[PDB]
Design a binder for this molecule. Structure first.
Ligand SMILES: Nc1ncnc2c1ncn2[C@@H]1O[C@H](COP(=O)(O)OP(=O)(O)OP(=O)(O)O)[C@@H](O)[C@H]1O
Ligand SMILES: Nc1ncnc2c1ncn2[C@@H]1O[C@H](COP(=O)(O)OP(=O)(O)O)[C@@H](O)[C@H]1O
Ligand SMILES: Nc1ncnc2c1ncn2[C@@H]1O[C@H](COP(=O)(O)OP(=O)(O)O)[C@@H](O)[C@H]1O
Ligand SMILES: [Mg+2]
Lengths: 501, 477, 477
């Protein structure tokens, strides 16, 4: 795209073949005239130096979705061609930054002139490039990892009602990558692409800064489609961060992408189309509400050595309305993603945080993610609670029944105080192996709970204070040792009487 | 500057249909968002441009009655959004949805006027600094806390909270607070708007004599078309802004219903040539509650301790109206109609009243723990109250029967009647900034103090009163 | 033969709008259903004609990304529906929604290719002969039986059964069965599609070396537009067909969701110029689930022991999607989410899992009686579990308290975990083709054997294990 010498552009617009003069416009859907050679998606140029992508090529107009509020775009604005389907910037450069949602930086840290772009319209690889999700990804959220193990190269949907923890979790899952982003094993690393869709730009600055406090921002890329941004930005954003990680999922490296509020993009998608006059379907959602959240997730895939060995794990965040997880959009999104961590506001305050509803959630990918560690411990944990939903909701009125049945219920209450992860700090996998493991191997149990949290906090200090070996056995063998079991046993048993006279 | 081209910025009204007046300019097409001027008038008829329909014709959203409009009437193109007089020279005064003085005390002599459509604070304008701000109101203060530059929001249908709590907060706040104050009443009653004026006179806040007025009154309500209820909340916002920015102060801002910015769309969308959506709404509600609410925020130049209110159509939180808004309120309070029955006032409910400033670092480890424990006991409480025992308490399991004393008393301790409800029974307007919240409430959950004859501790919060009421209503022999 | 007239069968794209590309031919208007060829391309872009709009212009439903399409691009008229290479020379291989090799092992050298749009078996093609076929799966086999040339269909929302049971049946079936096998994954995950490939390698089924492949892999999923998910299930069907007809064999056919043939309409109807319907859908869902499903049937030339899966949008059976489909499945299994909680797996429910081959002549008088009696006791069970006693069992009426032992144990006996769930707890993948179903289950309902400590018989079906578990978990002294 170019112009001439003789003032401000001189020669360009003169031909409706490569340009076009706006016919109508309102609510950012410039029905541009001309633009004959426009392609079905080549983002175009308005007179007010503004981006928009030709979305409806038609017999006597192109119907363009305008990027950003209206004001300047006005009936007659010359429109220029940028022959290139919806593409955005990418590369290692964007590391340690925060940009809008189309590429360019926002955090006043200057330019990030990239030299390797990446279209967003890319098709998901396939049966062949992908292999098997092995080499998990440690969140650091005990309750998550041990219970609901995330694998690399997969989509783990984290659903939760308003104020339930959907972002703390994603902020701890990303924070955990700390140690590795400067450690030894380069393959045992992780780059993150935190996307924000809808959110007030100050909630996003709460995160950029917060992450920056733990230096996390140093090994992460964050992008925003915050309220101000016209619905399209809130629409193109996920498809932008997807292309961010794909650098890594196509270059050996790996990534953890958090799509913050696909549902908020749900609210923000139906807009762009309705205004395009594309016949609405269910609750406004444009018919292709599936192809909207399928087409995307389907890009976070596991990569085979023959294709790269890289990956891209993607946890799409979803708004639970009062508890219903089966609403149109949630169905749409849970009918694709493998593994959905449910976060229940309904529980939260009870102390039951993260608050994950076993039964209406799964890891799906199977035991593959949970390393030999969890397959040695966590193997019982989640399904222990599955049917337990009954006895936990039954014991409250039990009497002349199976006397000793009390055991299966006792393994719940006690365990609960340990399964409730919650703090601005992740517990490394070998630490998860320390505390939670002790539980599955009924040792703490019988003791009157409550003080259990004192354990899950102190036990750690106790470890690094006089038990730095045990964890290392995990870094040697990679499982709980017959020897180490004996030792940890000799440490937790002491805690029974650690508060017992 | 507001000046057109060397060609007519005059358009002849081609079609009036209710709150929508299509206009057609031949030598000066006026931009989306531009405030327009109806000639031939007997008053002030500004039609805000909205779309650029083609055939050299805009499409404006009328700011007041379209009555008597005529197909051919000249419409004047100003050259800028509806711009109100922003400054100190508008405090104490009352402004309508265009900057016209509505309190009747004449011209608003001002140095300039800010456009009501301005680019919001960017991302590097923001400020993480979340400094606390006490309201001295049980749930509303302790439970779901507030904060400087924060965002309040109350959720109840028709009459349960909102206006009342906005006056309440006005008491516990508006009266004593450095900097200024603003109140943009959107949609809601003109009655309250008048009293509020007079109450603001009787109490000094608004002084017609000296020049000791800290508040500003921007109004745009019910007896008006939607194009005015749409922007009124904007002006009362274009107001809080200039006080923070160009006059670096920590303003506040009371919006009697901010979602009235949405009913306006529910009344102008489809009639603008749009395809409906959620319940009918608009393919915009999102960016709307967005674009605007992304204005009443702090910055590296000043803070806006704003306060808003959001209605609950058909008593349905399931409406994309109170909902979509949630993601903006730095404090929640969904008041239950099912609660009003129980008397519990304010009707702030024990689950749907979140926050983004409730960590043990700012609100407290002890306090946040008892809060968690209050709601914890409250949850299994919500179940037990019906499930298992089936309505009638007693039964068995003193563990939850404990809940029937604890949680119950808790609901009471949190049912702070306060000053604003003085007109129903002149009751003890309980409040007090924390102070003796320690010991008292803590006792209940643990079991300390809890046991006094249930309802004997209903219309009062501070535990001290339990024994101080036991005398009022006793029982024994 | 695919050859046009002595005039241009080339059309210049006049309008692209998402998954719809209107084309305009001047000297050769190409029929509804014809597979078209986009020129100017950098790949394969077949647009299937759909309507004949007039003004010498068709209207095609695009088979893949419409990205970069241009108003003027030449579209090539082939002269026949999207026709895939049908034959033995496509078993073991993996085909996409057009006949393009997607497993990457190159060209599919074939003698010919069948059209994906063919006249279904007529009425005098049909065959009443309903010969049994055992799956060795409690409910799924005993309760609601299957049959040769039958039709399976599972009903659950997102993750409760379907894919899992399709792999399960693949185990108990796909591995050992004469004739061939097909798997058309529609809509669903690409992950499962890959593993399934590899699992089909690890177990021989798909052998890349010799030529000992009995299955064929036709895929068209999620990362694709609707026009492909629409026909993929068709190709995986155009596949099972030629194996039965022109190669008289008793094929099977696994469709990972066949109603994905409908979501395709929910995504292309209205955008084709149609007036919406049930939830939005299409004035076609009927004939759709019709016309297609009326293909995977037997005949006087061969049988197709097909297997499908149908999703449950919004967890609503009340959706005309799982529903309209019911009338096609020769076996039902509506898996309950409310069941998943209870663990009961597969989640096949005790009421909504019918059949058209459950008469005492084929399934059994004894067995069908206990089935009836299982559900009988189960019905008043569904009521008693809540009605009368109110949640808590015990109470009175040992008649129904009997139900609390019988029906309960019954639910367990039917909760066969099986092999496919090996990834959650590596549990005893119970199965076995009937064999010792006699005595065991019969005992329960009559009262024989029934009494062992309730949940002591939960994660296992065969009664023998009750005492064989009593040792695992005992109780007495
Ligand atoms: N680990 C934790 N344990 C207990 N409470 C937590 C924990 N992490 C966060 N919280 C607090 O609980 C709330 C949950 O996080 P967050 O606010 O991001 O939730 P959300 O579900 O993403 O919703 P939204 O961001 O829209 O409010 C916040 O106030 C948060 O700071
Ligand atoms: N502080 C209060 N205490 C008790 N009841 C109240 C209080 N405020 C309002 N109410 C009840 O709510 C009714 C109207 O609700 P109100 O809060 O005044 O509506 P809104 O504030 O939305 O305009 C009252 O007339 C009264 O029954
Ligand atoms: N055989 C089974 N036994 C127990 N639970 C199962 C079984 N199959 C699936 N599930 C449960 O269902 C969840 C997902 O459902 P699944 O059947 O795999 O979905 P679909 O088959 O529709 O793709 C699992 O992750 C698990 O909790
Ligand atoms: Mg959040």
């Amino acid at each position: 795209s170019s112009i001439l010498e003789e003032r401000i552009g001189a020669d360009t617009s003169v031909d409706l073949e490569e340009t076009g003069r706006v016919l109508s416009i309102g609510d950012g859907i410039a029905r541009v005239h001309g633009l004959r050679n426009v392609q079905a998606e080549e983002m175009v140029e308005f007179s007010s130096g503004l981006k928009g992508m030709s979305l409806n090529l038609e017999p006597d107009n192109v119907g363009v979705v305008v990027f950003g509020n209206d004001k300047l775009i006005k009936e007659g604005d010359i429109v220029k061609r940028t022959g290139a389907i919806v593409d955005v910037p990418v590369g290692d450069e964007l590391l340690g930054r925060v940009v809008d949602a189309l590429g360019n930086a926002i955090d006043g840290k200057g330019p990030v002139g990239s030299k390797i772009r990446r279209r967003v319209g890319l098709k998901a690889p396939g049966i062949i490039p992908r292999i098997s999700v092995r080499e998990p990804m440690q969140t650091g959220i005990k309750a998550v990892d041990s219970l609901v193990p995330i694998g690399r190269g997969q989509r783990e949907l984290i659903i939760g009602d308003r104020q339930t923890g959907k972002t703390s979790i994603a902020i701890d899952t990303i924070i955990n990558q700390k140690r590795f982003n400067d450690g030894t094993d380069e393959k045992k690393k992780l780059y993150c692409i935190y996307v924000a869709i809808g959110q007030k730009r100050s909630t996003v600055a709460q995160l950029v800064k917060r992450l920056t406090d733990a230096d996390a921002m140093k090994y992460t890329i964050v992008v925003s489609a915050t309220a101000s941004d016209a619905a399209p930005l809130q629409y193109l954003a996920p498809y932008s961060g997807c292309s961010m990680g794909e650098y890594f999922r196509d270059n050996g490296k790996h990534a953890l992408i958090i799509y913050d509020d696909l549902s908020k993009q749900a609210v923000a998608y139906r807009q762009m189309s309705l205004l395009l006059r594309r016949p609405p379907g269910r609750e406004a959602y444009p018919g292709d509400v599936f192809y909207l959240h399928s087409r995307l997730l389907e890009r976070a895939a596991k990569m085979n050595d023959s294709f790269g060995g890289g990956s891209l794990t993607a946890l799409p965040v979803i708004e639970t309305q009062a508890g219903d997880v089966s609403a149109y959009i949630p169905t749409n999104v849970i009918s694709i993603t493998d593994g959905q961590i449910f976060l229940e506001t309904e529980l939260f305050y009870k102390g039951i945080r993260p608050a994950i509803n076993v039964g209406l959630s799964v890891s799906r990918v199977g035991s593959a993610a949970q390393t030999r560690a969890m397959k040695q411990v966590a193997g019982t944990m989640k399904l222990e609670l599955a049917q337990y939903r009954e006895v936990a909701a039954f014991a409250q009125f039990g009497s002349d029944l199976d006397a000793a049945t009390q055991q299966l219920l006792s393994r719940g209450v006690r365990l609960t105080e340990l399964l409730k992860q919650g703090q601005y700090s992740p517990m490394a996998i070998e630490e998860q192996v320390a505390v939670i493991y002790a539980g599955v191997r009924g040792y703490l149990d019988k003791l009157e709970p409550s003080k259990i949290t004192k354990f899950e906090s102190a036990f750690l200090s106790h470890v690094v204070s006089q038990h730095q070996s045990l964890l290392g056995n995990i870094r040697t063998d990679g499982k709980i040792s017959e020897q180490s079991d004996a030792k940890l046993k000799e440490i937790v048993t002491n805690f029974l009487a650690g508060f017992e006279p | 500057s507001a000046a057109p081209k060397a060609g007519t910025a005059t358009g002849q009204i081609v079609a009036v249909i209710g709150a929508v007046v299509d206009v057609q300019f031949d030598e000066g097409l006026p931009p989306i968002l531009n405030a327009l001027e109806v000639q031939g008038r007997e008053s002030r008829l500004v039609l805000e441009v909205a779309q650029h329909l083609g055939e050299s014709t805009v499409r404006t959203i009328a700011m007041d009655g379209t009555e008597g409009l005529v197909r051919g009437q000249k419409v004047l193109d100003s050259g800028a959004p509806i711009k109100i007089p922003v400054g100190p020279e508008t405090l104490g005064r009352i402004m309508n949805v265009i900057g016209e003085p509505i309190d009747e005390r004449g011209p608003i002599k001002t140095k300039q006027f800010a456009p009501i459509h301005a680019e919001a604070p960017e991302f590097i304008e923001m400020s993480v600094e979340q400094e606390i701000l006490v309201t001295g109101i049980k749930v509303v203060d302790l439970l779901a806390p507030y904060a400087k530059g924060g965002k309040i929001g109350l959720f109840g249908g028709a009459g349960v909270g909102k206006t009342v709590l906005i006056m309440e907060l006005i008491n516990n706040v508006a009266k004593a607070h450095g900097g200024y104050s603003v109140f943009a009443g959107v949609g809601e009653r003109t009655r309250e708007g008048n009293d509020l004026y007079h109450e603001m006179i009787e109490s000094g806040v608004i002084n017609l004599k000296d020049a000791t007025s800290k508040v500003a009154l921007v109004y745009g309500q019910m007896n008006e078309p939607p194009g005015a209820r749409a922007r009124v909340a904007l002006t009362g916002l274009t107001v809080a802004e200039y006080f923070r920015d160009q006059e670096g102060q920590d303003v506040l801002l009371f919006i009697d219903n901010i979602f009235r910015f949405t009913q306006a769309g529910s009344e102008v969308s489809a009639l603008l040539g749009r395809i409906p959506s959620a319940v009918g709404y608009q393919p915009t509600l999102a960016t709307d509650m967005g674009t605007m609410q992304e204005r009443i925020t702090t910055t590296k130049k000043g803070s806006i301790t704003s306060v808003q209110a959001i209605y609950v159509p058909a008593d349905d939180l399931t409406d994309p109206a109170p909902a979509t808004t949630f993601a903006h309120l730095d404090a929640t309070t969904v008041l239950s109609r099912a609660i009003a029955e129980l008397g519990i006032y304010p009707a702030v409910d024990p689950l749907d009243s979140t926050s983004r400033i409730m960590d043990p670092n700012i609100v407290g480890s002890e306090h946040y723990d008892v809060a968690r424990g209050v709601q914890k006991i409250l949850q299994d409480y919500k179940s037990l109250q019906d499930i298992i025992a089936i309505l009638g308490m007693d039964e068995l399991s003193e563990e939850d029967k404990l809940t029937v004393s604890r949680a119950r008393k808790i609901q009471r301790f949190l049912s702070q009647p306060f000053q604003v409800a003085e007109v129903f029974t002149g009751h003890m307007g309980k409040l007090v900034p924390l102070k003796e919240t320690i010991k008292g409430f803590q006792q209940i959950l643990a079991g300390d103090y809890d046991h006094l004859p249930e309802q004997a501790f209903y219309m009062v919060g501070p535990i001290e009163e339990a024994v101080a009421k036991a005398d009022k209503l006793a029982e024994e022999h």
